Design an enzyme around this catalytic site. Structure first.
Site, PDB file in Angstrom:
ATOM      1  N   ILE A 136     -31.279  44.659  73.435  1.00  0.00           N
ATOM      2  CA  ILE A 136     -31.054  45.382  74.505  1.00  0.00           C
ATOM      3  C   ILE A 136     -30.486  44.657  75.594  1.00  0.00           C
ATOM      4  O   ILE A 136     -31.083  43.314  75.914  1.00  0.00           O
ATOM      5  CB  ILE A 136     -32.441  45.991  74.979  1.00  0.00           C
ATOM      6  CG1 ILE A 136     -32.876  47.179  73.969  1.00  0.00           C
ATOM      7  CG2 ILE A 136     -32.376  46.626  76.404  1.00  0.00           C
ATOM      8  CD1 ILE A 136     -34.316  47.763  74.325  1.00  0.00           C
ATOM      9  N   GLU A 188     -36.528  47.881  66.924  1.00  0.00           N
ATOM     10  CA  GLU A 188     -37.115  47.436  65.848  1.00  0.00           C
ATOM     11  C   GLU A 188     -37.198  48.470  64.730  1.00  0.00           C
ATOM     12  O   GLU A 188     -37.077  48.185  63.372  1.00  0.00           O
ATOM     13  CB  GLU A 188     -38.186  46.697  65.957  1.00  0.00           C
ATOM     14  CG  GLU A 188     -38.525  45.523  67.223  1.00  0.00           C
ATOM     15  CD  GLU A 188     -37.766  44.212  66.415  1.00  0.00           C
ATOM     16  OE1 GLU A 188     -37.103  44.219  65.427  1.00  0.00           O
ATOM     17  OE2 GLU A 188     -37.780  43.309  67.067  1.00  0.00           O
ATOM     18  N   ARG A 228     -33.978  48.925  62.600  1.00  0.00           N
ATOM     19  CA  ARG A 228     -34.016  47.779  61.646  1.00  0.00           C
ATOM     20  C   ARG A 228     -34.909  48.013  60.576  1.00  0.00           C
ATOM     21  O   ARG A 228     -34.295  47.483  59.733  1.00  0.00           O
ATOM     22  CB  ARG A 228     -34.083  46.473  62.407  1.00  0.00           C
ATOM     23  CG  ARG A 228     -33.121  46.194  63.647  1.00  0.00           C
ATOM     24  CD  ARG A 228     -33.712  45.007  64.271  1.00  0.00           C
ATOM     25  NE  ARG A 228     -32.713  44.477  65.311  1.00  0.00           N
ATOM     26  CZ  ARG A 228     -33.087  43.750  66.317  1.00  0.00           C
ATOM     27  NH1 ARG A 228     -34.527  43.568  66.713  1.00  0.00           N
ATOM     28  NH2 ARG A 228     -32.189  43.216  67.234  1.00  0.00           N
TER      29      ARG A 228
HETATM   30  O1  LIG Z   1     -37.386  36.617  70.374  1.00  0.00           O
HETATM   31  C1  LIG Z   1     -36.607  37.706  70.485  1.00  0.00           C
HETATM   32  C2  LIG Z   1     -37.354  38.935  70.809  1.00  0.00           C
HETATM   33  C3  LIG Z   1     -36.433  40.181  70.867  1.00  0.00           C
HETATM   34  N1  LIG Z   1     -35.457  40.132  70.312  1.00  0.00           N
HETATM   35  C4  LIG Z   1     -34.884  41.374  70.589  1.00  0.00           C
HETATM   36  O2  LIG Z   1     -34.529  41.513  72.040  1.00  0.00           O
HETATM   37  C5  LIG Z   1     -33.615  42.537  71.987  1.00  0.00           C
HETATM   38  C6  LIG Z   1     -33.376  42.531  73.596  1.00  0.00           C
HETATM   39  O3  LIG Z   1     -33.206  41.442  74.227  1.00  0.00           O
HETATM   40  P1  LIG Z   1     -31.790  40.501  74.538  1.00  0.00           P
HETATM   41  O4  LIG Z   1     -30.846  40.717  73.621  1.00  0.00           O
HETATM   42  O5  LIG Z   1     -31.350  40.737  75.724  1.00  0.00           O
HETATM   43  O6  LIG Z   1     -32.405  38.871  74.257  1.00  0.00           O
HETATM   44  P2  LIG Z   1     -31.800  37.789  73.402  1.00  0.00           P
HETATM   45  O7  LIG Z   1     -32.407  38.244  72.108  1.00  0.00           O
HETATM   46  O8  LIG Z   1     -30.258  38.121  73.374  1.00  0.00           O
HETATM   47  O9  LIG Z   1     -32.188  36.737  74.030  1.00  0.00           O
HETATM   48  C7  LIG Z   1     -34.435  43.617  71.088  1.00  0.00           C
HETATM   49  O10 LIG Z   1     -33.535  44.499  70.394  1.00  0.00           O
HETATM   50  C8  LIG Z   1     -35.133  42.628  70.037  1.00  0.00           C
HETATM   51  O11 LIG Z   1     -34.696  42.216  68.905  1.00  0.00           O
HETATM   52  C9  LIG Z   1     -34.665  39.003  70.374  1.00  0.00           C
HETATM   53  O12 LIG Z   1     -33.406  38.883  70.122  1.00  0.00           O
HETATM   54  N2  LIG Z   1     -35.280  37.686  70.201  1.00  0.00           N
END
Ligand SMILES: O=c1ccn([C@@H]2O[C@H](COP(=O)(O)OP(=O)(O)O)[C@@H](O)[C@H]2O)c(=O)[nH]1
Ligand SMILES: *[C@@H]1O[C@H](CO)[C@@H](O)[C@H](O)[C@H]1NC(C)=O
Length: 246
Positions: free
Chosen positions: A71, A160, A163
């Protein structure tokens, strides 16, 4: 775009939403019969919009990166909100441009930072369809501390669940009563990148993982996943993060 309405929602309609979400993510290849997400997508095609309606029919639109199901941000009325990270900043160049104002949230979207901002680990945050209804309502009106918890709920009940079939089923079990995620749920969330990688590495390794993945099962027991015959691979995981992004 895909949509979900909490008004009149039940395990069936939620299941249809998670199916639509999965089906909206492009792929050109399956690996051990699981869709392999693309290495990259250029421009606006990178982002899927999820239209979510709370029980009263108010709506937010959530932007999801289709290469990793992350997201990036969301639109609520005339205000856009993006995570404080370069991937989300890039997304803001393509989605919700017509918003009257754009707020950058005071955290990135990873679980560690969100849990810090929320003041609790997601082991202690109930999830379910009622919690999703609440999360949507919370995100309609800016409050960054409240939003962190709402976003933890949103991520788990959307990405999640897309997935992992197990997580989708967990949420279906919580259609009318929230409950904190099982430790198996947490384990799977934490292992998606690792599993995605090892399933891909197994291709030229006779279905065997180069490095075993440690998971917690439904009974709370810690198990090693070593090869593609595991039920996690054959029945549970529904999407693979491309190794190019790991
Ligand atoms: O440690 C985490 C925790 C959550 N998510 C993901 O966070 C997404 C939304 O966050 P975003 O992509 O902005 O953060 P990023 O993961 O790129 O740091 C969700 O679909 C979760 O899979 C993740 O990538 N890393
Ligand atoms: C592969 O995993 C299965 C399922 O857990 C297990 O029973 C088996 O011992 C493993 N086989 C190999 C060759 O690693």
């Amino acid at each position: 775009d895909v949509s979900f309405r909490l008004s009149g929602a039940d395990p069936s309609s939620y299941g249809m939403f998670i199916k639509d979400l999965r089906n909206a993510l492009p792929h050109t290849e399956k690996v051990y019969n699981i869709p392999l997400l693309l290495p990259s997508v250029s421009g606006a095609g990178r982002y899927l919009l999820m239209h979510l309606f709370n029980y009263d029919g108010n709506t937010i639109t959530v932007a999801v990166d289709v290469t990793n199901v992350y997201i990036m941000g969301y639109l609520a009325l005339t205000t856009s909100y993006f995570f404080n990270e370069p991937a989300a900043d890039l997304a803001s160049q393509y989605v919700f441009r017509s918003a009257r104002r754009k707020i950058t949230l005071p955290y990135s979207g990873n679980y560690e930072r969100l849990q810090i901002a929320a003041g609790k680990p997601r082991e202690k945050i109930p999830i379910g369809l009622p919690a999703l209804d609440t999360a949507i309502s919370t995100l309609l009106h800016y409050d960054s501390t409240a939003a962190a918890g709402a976003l933890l709920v949103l991520i788990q009940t959307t990405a999640e669940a897309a997935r992992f079939k197990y997580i989708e089923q967990q949420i279906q079990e919580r259609a009318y009563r929230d409950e904190v995620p099982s430790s198996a749920t947490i384990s799977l969330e934490n292992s998606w990148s690792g599993l995605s990688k090892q399933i891909q590495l197994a291709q030229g390794n006779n279905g065997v993982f180069r490095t075993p993945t440690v998971l917690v099962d439904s009974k709370g027991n810690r198990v090693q996943i070593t090869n593609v015959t595991s039920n996690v691979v054959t029945s549970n995981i529904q999407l693979l993060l491309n190794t190019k992004n790991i």
